[PDB]
Design a protein around this ligand. Structure first.
Ligand SMILES: Nc1ncnc2c1ncn2[C@@H]1O[C@H](COP(=O)(O)OP(=O)(O)OP(=O)(O)O)[C@@H](O)[C@H]1O
Ligand SMILES: [Mg+2]
Lengths: 101, 87, 68, 298, 87, 54, 289, 159
């Protein structure tokens, strides 16, 4: 039963048109945050009930649902070049002794 | 308080797409450029005083029909916050 | 102006349109802005030519005063 | 006219239409319906896109007596060419139940309209057919060579269904049935194996009975059917071919891979035994703790 | 006949052309549109895949973005001129 | 996951579950349904990359 | 006190449904329009037996695109064929938008309201349907007066109903201005269902057709080789795997995209087919000869 | 008439304006002013021969088709600049440099009037003169006076 449920759930998520990504530029007391929605221009938009002006932090990257621009989740997640350089690099090998002389 | 509140929810459907006030013509209309290449000859409707608005101000416009629903911006950019390091 | 008018929008897209309530021929000139409706695409008001003077009129300062 | 009529595709909408027309004229139980079929032609695939009822009166005293309102077929055509130019006159449907020799006459009247050969689509609206309740037939003109004059006849063209993309997504969404044959799982094709045999057995009977009827009812000798049956006995598989010996080795390959894949499923089930079993052993421990933890608070 | 041509043309509806950017498979082919964005479109079994080649212009329905058939390759006057010259 | 379209409109699009995340997670061209605007299937790295193998 | 003002459940027949997907979807980007022919019974049951496309117009959909000249003309042809039934409404297609009425389509609705007060305005969005039947809705006018004096509750007295919810801007505009929506239902006969699936003789004829044996060889070879590769991985899975925390196990032994499970699936499909293959071949050989 | 009234409906404003980049030939490639590229079936009502490169055309807003033709749009800035022959500075009043005046007049004036003679002999007439070197030598000026003499419309233009 659960497998039939699972395949269906996968189906329903994908539907969602839009779905973006902004960054909280600053916070105001009006149950809103000014977001520079990154692919778009700017939007001053109200918070979703799930995550509020309290929780939000300035310069935190955020997910957004559809063309509504309601808050989904906060993303810690940041694209930076240093991080990208680390992935090429991987876990640095190797014991002191081998170097040792 | 109750006054402010009731009104604000009604008028403001969201999201609200910001503009820049380029000029005023005295007849409670303004000419603004939106982020879209077409600019829009808008009504000033409700809230913010006509006097208080001086050209070069950044402004909140309502998404269904573009109208001056107020200001809370004052040409806020992230660049100013970055620089600002009173800390 | 072709005696309807050929308008060019700022997204760059050209239409042949017409007068709305009643817009005199003599008001619409090359370079003159126009107000047209979202999607019914007709002139209401001719609008003064260009939005670019307004931008640059901020820089302009009037007759400064200093004693010689 | 045109001789390109090699394939016939049929929208399901047509099918739906043919019953609808039958009931709105209130024709029933050996009252006949003739309508125009519209669609594309002068092309190999005749694409029957639509159909529309026409004025038709049926007389039972004289079967060669009917009404058609000739002017109306012209008029209606004019309207639909304006709606969509791709639709053209392409013939006429009959509701059956069967083809007749009056349908030959009827064909002739549509021939005038049509710049293609008029397609006679026999839609049985009752759907008594086990398979296809729809036959497609094209009026051809050929010398029947036997010492008989030029004969005009309706030669069977196999037909298939087809659906436009736009309709089809909606057809599928309407349907949700488990099907007599979907080509699904083992048990489903297995049903089809029982069906397919009983199919053949009825099908062969029809042949035996025609052979009786030739010498008892004097049906005209059709040297053509009998010619095709010669090819059946002639090309017939036989045993003691080296082909049997080849099939016989093949049998052994097909069971042997099956056997090994059976054995492999044994190992997977045996794996799950262990995993669930390990959990149980742990479950014993958590259960004992419950009793142990109750003692400590007391 | 000439006034009938218009009514017919409105029912034929403007076509989008791309061009074969890159064969990927028999069943799926990568085209880049003339209008713009890159797409993966499909090919009908009505049109043989041997005809379809890299840099041949192709025509696709808007509705579903799938290649109906081949078109003759775009007429380039330049390479015609080059051939002609000598006499 | 996070992707850009052909035009660059940055979408956060769901990865249809039980697909590759062993090579998908590094950059590679990928295909998104047009209507759904979701990541429904993957492309080999060969698509839209110059063939230097000579 | 007054009127219920009740909004009909719009009972859309399958025949009518199929012509709507065909004409509208194909005709993208250009909008298409047409009337709905039906019979109205009860105060809540409208049966829309048929639809047709009225001849295209370059004004697309407007008050004047639609016409009485077109209306009458078509009626007269169907009049003779006895398939004539009263106009119960009008449809048109929006292929670029979701289900809602333009400011213009309300005015168009208003002329059909005057004709017949049970007249529906149905907005068909067919390209941005991925099942066909979805995102098509039927509507009816509500007066400007009706909104003020609060006659929206009456219409849905004692019925669960469906009020549509997709499109937030365009919907809330429609819900509180353009029209009131109620549920839209599809009905069909069990004579027709038989026709929609289509029975064929080639369903069963294909079951005694014996495909070539090169193709059986390929399947035998292929399926077995494949599971050799994931059988190495399976050895890796069960090498230890018995230390605590289940999540930990699934990343380390790559029990994500489960190799045990994939072995089972490839095995089952081939096992099932090779049994069909022996079963058909045995039936063919005795049965023929 | 039935067709013509349908055609009128399409023609009802608004409609798109576009140009014909070419006729491929039959079929026509239009370049729209919406910045997309559309290959459309050539509307047989419209003469293919009448159409030329950069012939302006009316194109229906919905299904893109060559409905009608339009007069090519014109640039008043270019029109205004044309006819600036007047005042004729006169070569006399243009300060110094006899030599350059004599040279310009060979290249320009004489071929203009003697054009029959040029055809007969068959040699090319001067296909343009470029003036270059230091400013202040009256590059401007010369052209204005010369054009006036040749009675030929003087566009003062910058690419
Ligand atoms: N040959 C001349 N005699 C007298 N005055 C001259 C002469 N040439 C130029 N000047 C004066 O200088 C002014 C400016 O000319 P300018 O320097 O623009 O010259 P030009 O040769 O046309 O160069 P350019 O267009 O490259 O700037 C003229 O309006 C004229 O009064
Ligand atoms: Mg100069």
């Amino acid at each position: 039963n659960d497998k039939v449920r699972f395949i269906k759930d996968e189906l329903r998520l994908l539907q969602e048109p839009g779905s973006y990504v902004g960054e909280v530029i600053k916070i105001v007391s009006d149950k809103k945050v000014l977001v520079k929605v990154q692919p778009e221009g700017k939007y001053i938009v109200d918070v979703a009930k799930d995550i509020n002006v309290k929780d939000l932090k300035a310069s935190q990257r955020v997910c957004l649902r559809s063309d509504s621009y309601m808050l989904h989740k906060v993303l810690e997640n940041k694209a930076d070049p240093l991080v990208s350089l680390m992935m090429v690099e991987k876990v640095p090998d190797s014991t002191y002794d081998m170097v040792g002389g | 308080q109750e006054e402010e509140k009731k009104q604000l929810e009604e008028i403001r459907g969201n999201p609200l797409s910001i503009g820049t006030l380029e000029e005023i013509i005295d007849d409670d209309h303004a000419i603004v450029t939106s982020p879209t290449m077409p600019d829009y000859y808008v009504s000033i409707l409700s809230f913010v005083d006509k006097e208080l608005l001086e050209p070069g101000c950044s402004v909140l416009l309502h998404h269904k029909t573009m109208s001056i629903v107020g200001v809370l911006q004052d040409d806020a950019d992230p660049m100013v916050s970055v620089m600002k390091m009173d800390k | 102006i072709i005696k309807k008018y050929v308008i060019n929008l700022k997204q760059i897209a050209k239409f042949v349109v017409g007068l709305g309530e009643r817009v005199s021929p003599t008001d619409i000139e090359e370079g003159m802005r126009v107000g047209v409706d979202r999607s019914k695409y007709n002139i209401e008001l001719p609008l003064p030519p260009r939005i670019d003077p307004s931008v640059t009129m901020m820089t302009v300062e009037e007759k400064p005063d200093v004693t010689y | 006219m045109s001789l390109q009529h090699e394939k016939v595709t049929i929208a399901p909408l047509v099918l739906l239409s043919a019953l609808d027309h039958y009931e709105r004229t209130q024709t029933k139980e050996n009252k006949r319906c003739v309508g125009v079929i519209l669609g594309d032609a002068n092309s190999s695939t005749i694409r029957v896109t639509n159909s529309f009822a026409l004025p038709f009166e049926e007389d039972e005293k004289n079967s060669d007596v009917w009404f058609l309102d000739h002017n109306y077929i012209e008029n209606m055509n004019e309207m639909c060419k304006k709606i969509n130019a791709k639709e053209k006159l392409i013939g006429w449907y009959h509701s059956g139940p069967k083809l007749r020799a009056s349908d030959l006459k009827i064909n002739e009247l549509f021939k005038k309209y049509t710049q293609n050969n008029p397609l006679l689509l026999i839609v049985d609206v009752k759907q008594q057919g086990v398979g296809l309740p729809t036959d497609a037939y094209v009026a051809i003109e050929q010398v029947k060579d036997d010492g008989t004059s030029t004969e005009k006849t309706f030669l069977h063209l196999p037909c298939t269904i087809e659906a436009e993309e736009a309709e089809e997504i909606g057809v599928e969404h309407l349907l949700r049935d488990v099907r007599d044959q979907a080509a699904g799982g083992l048990s489903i094709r297995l049903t089809n194996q029982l069906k397919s045999l009983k199919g053949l057995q009825s099908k062969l009977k029809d042949v035996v009975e025609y052979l009786d009827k030739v010498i008892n009812k004097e049906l005209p000798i059709n040297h053509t059917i009998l010619g095709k049956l010669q090819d059946v006995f002639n090309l017939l598989p036989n045993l003691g071919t080296p082909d049997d010996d080849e099939i016989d080795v093949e049998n052994h390959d097909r069971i042997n891979i099956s056997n090994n894949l059976q054995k492999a499923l044994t190992v997977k089930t045996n794996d799950e035994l262990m995993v669930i079993y390990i959990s149980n052993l742990v479950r014993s421990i958590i259960a004992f703790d419950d009793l142990i933890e109750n003692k400590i608070q007391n | 006949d000439k006034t009938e041509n218009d009514i017919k043309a409105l029912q034929s509806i403007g076509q989008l052309i791309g061009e074969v950017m890159k064969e990927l498979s028999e069943e799926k082919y990568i085209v880049k549109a003339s209008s713009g964005p890159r797409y993966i479109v499909g090919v009908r079994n009505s049109v043989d895949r041997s005809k379809l080649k890299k840099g041949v212009r192709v025509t696709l329905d808007i509705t579903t973005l799938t290649i109906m058939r081949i078109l003759p390759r775009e007429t380039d006057p330049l390479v015609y001129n080059m051939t002609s010259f000598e006499q | 996951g996070i992707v850009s379209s052909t035009t660059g409109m940055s979408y956060v699009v769901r990865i249809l579950s039980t697909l590759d995340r062993e090579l998908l997670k590094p950059s590679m061209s990928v295909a998104l349904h047009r209507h759904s605007n979701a990541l429904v299937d993957i492309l080999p790295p060969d698509s839209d990359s110059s063939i230097s193998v000579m | 006190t007054g009127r219920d003002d009740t909004k009909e459940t719009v009972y859309i027949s399958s025949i009518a449904l199929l012509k709507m997907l065909k004409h509208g979807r194909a005709g993208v980007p250009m909008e298409v329009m047409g009337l709905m022919l039906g019979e109205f019974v009860d105060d809540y049951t409208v049966n829309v037996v048929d639809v047709f496309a009225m001849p295209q117009s370059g004004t697309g959909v407007s008050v004047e695109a639609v016409d009485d000249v077109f209306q009458a003309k078509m009626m007269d042809m169907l009049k003779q064929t006895g398939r004539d039934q009263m106009v119960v409404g009008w449809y048109h297609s929006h292929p670029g938008f979701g289900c809602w009425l333009s400011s213009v389509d309300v005015n168009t609705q208003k002329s059909f309201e005057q004709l017949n007060s049970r007249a529906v305005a149905v907005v068909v969005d067919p390209i941005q349907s991925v099942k066909g039947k979805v995102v098509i809705d039927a509507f009816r006018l509500i007066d400007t007066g009706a909104l003020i004096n609060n006659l929206e509750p009456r219409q849905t007295t004692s019925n669960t109903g469906l009020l549509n919810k997709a499109n937030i801007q365009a919907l809330i505009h429609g819900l509180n201005r353009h029209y009131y929506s109620l549920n839209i239902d599809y009905h069909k006969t069990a004579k027709e269902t038989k026709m929609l699936m289509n029975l064929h003789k080639e369903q069963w004829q294909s079951g005694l057709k014996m495909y070539d044996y090169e193709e059986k060889e390929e399947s035998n070879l292929a399926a077995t080789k494949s599971m050799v590769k994931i059988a190495e991985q399976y050895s890796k899975r069960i090498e230890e795997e018995k230390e605590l925390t289940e999540e930990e196990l699934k990343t380390r032994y790559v029990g994500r995209q489960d190799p045990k499970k994939h072995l089972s699936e490839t095995a089952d499909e081939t096992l099932e087919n090779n049994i069909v293959s022996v079963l058909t071949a045995g039936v063919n050989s005795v049965a023929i000869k | 008439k039935d067709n013509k009234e349908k055609i009128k409906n399409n023609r009802q404003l608004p409609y798109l304006v576009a140009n014909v980049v070419e006729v491929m030939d039959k079929a026509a490639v239009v370049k729209t002013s919406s910045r997309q590229t559309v290959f459309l079936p050539m509307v047989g009502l419209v003469d293919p021969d009448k159409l030329k490169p950069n012939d302006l055309v009316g194109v229906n807003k919905d299904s893109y088709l060559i409905l009608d033709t339009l007069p090519s749009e014109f640039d008043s800035r270019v029109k205004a600049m044309e006819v600036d022959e007047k005042p004729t500075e006169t070569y006399s009043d243009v300060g110094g440099l006899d030599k350059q005046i004599e040279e310009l007049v060979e290249a320009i004036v004489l071929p203009m009037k003697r054009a029959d003679k040029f055809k007969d002999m068959g040699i090319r007439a001067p296909k343009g003169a470029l003036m270059y070197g230091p400013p202040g030598t009256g590059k401007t000026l010369l052209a204005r006076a010369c054009a006036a003499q040749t009675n030929a419309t003087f566009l003062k233009l910058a690419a």
